[PDB]
């Protein structure tokens, strides 16, 4: 590490740029250009529908996205009005069901059907990430991270100090991303899950009172995707992302 | 032979799946 270094590797978490913005206009413009490209392969009917769509996106841009926020708010209002109506038996909550099941098994006392449990593995990660010790190290590592890395060995090993600074810079970003990362890997659509939970609750009680294992739902989405062009499917990614910001702001 | 206990165990498994989903979402919201 030759040369009298002019500056010193002092850093602040405030100086580290942590924005995590989510822009909407460029995504919209990319949608527009994609539809423009599909126009060439489109037939006349879809050409007309796509011209209407293109004019709609240009209207959104000229009105500065307020029309789109209004539209997505309308759809989400329909959704949020829908779910409490499908809240069929609210007085009979969900944890009380296995008690009923134990009761019926006691009363009554074959190829079984399996289950795909996805949300229970993630619950195990909460048993780790929610610990106090794991957060203590986060609380004490970022404040004094030089203790962890062998900086003395690294400085002696590398003639240039720029490489050493880059290694230290990356470790913080890996740690900052770690603590701020959630247990989940994705953004769960809360409404479309409470829908299923409210419908599924509407099915178990009707089953408690009283072949193949196929899911006919998949024989509908396979038709829905076929009917729609691609730009509408991409438009769904846009509308979903706007529900995050509009609920945030 | 009867499918009643297997149906009831299906119900138990699916209900525990739903409750685990609920606890996951509750813990995420709390954070």
């Amino acid at each position: 590490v030759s040369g009298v270094a002019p500056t010193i590797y002092l850093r602040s978490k405030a100086a580290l740029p942590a924005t995590s913005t989510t822009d909407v206009r460029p995504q919209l413009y990319a949608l527009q250009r994609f539809a423009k490209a599909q126009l060439k392969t489109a037939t006349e009917a879809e050409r007309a529908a796509i011209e209407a769509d293109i004019a709609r996106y240009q209207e959104y841009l000229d009105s500065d996205l307020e029309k789109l926020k209004q539209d997505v708010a309308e759809d989400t209002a329909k959704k949020q009005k829908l779910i409490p109506l499908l809240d069929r038996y609210p007085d009979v909550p969900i944890e009380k069901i296995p008690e009923h099941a134990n009761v019926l098994l006691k009363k009554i006392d074959w190829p079984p059907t399996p289950v795909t449990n996805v949300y229970a593995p993630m619950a195990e990660k909460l048993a780790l990430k929610s610990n106090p010790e794991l957060k203590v190290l986060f609380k004490e590592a970022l404040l004094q991270p030089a203790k962890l890395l062998p900086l003395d060995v690294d400085y002696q090993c590398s003639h240039d100090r720029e490489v050493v600074e880059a290694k230290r810079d990356r470790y913080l970003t890996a740690l900052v991303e770690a603590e701020q990362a959630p247990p989940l890997p994705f953004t769960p659509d809360v409404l479309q899950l409470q829908l299923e939970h409210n419908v599924l609750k509407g099915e178990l009680i009707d089953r408690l009172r009283a072949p193949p294992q196929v899911n006919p739902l998949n024989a509908i989405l396979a038709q829905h995707t076929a009917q729609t062009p691609v730009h509408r499917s991409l438009e769904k990614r846009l509308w979903t992302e706007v529900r995050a910001t509009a609920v945030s702001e | 032979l009867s499918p009643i206990p297997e149906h009831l165990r299906l119900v138990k498994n699916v209900a525990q799946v739903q409750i685990d989903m609920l606890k996951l979402l509750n813990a995420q919201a709390a954070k």
């Binding site: 059907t113 996805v118 599924l200 099915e203 178990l204 899911n215 739902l217 | 499918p3 149906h7 699916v14």
Partner: peptide, 9 residues
């Protein structure tokens, strides 16, 4: 049939 629907599976 007695199976249950699960959209996310």
């Amino acid at each position: 049939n007695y199976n249950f629907i699960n959209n996310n599976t």
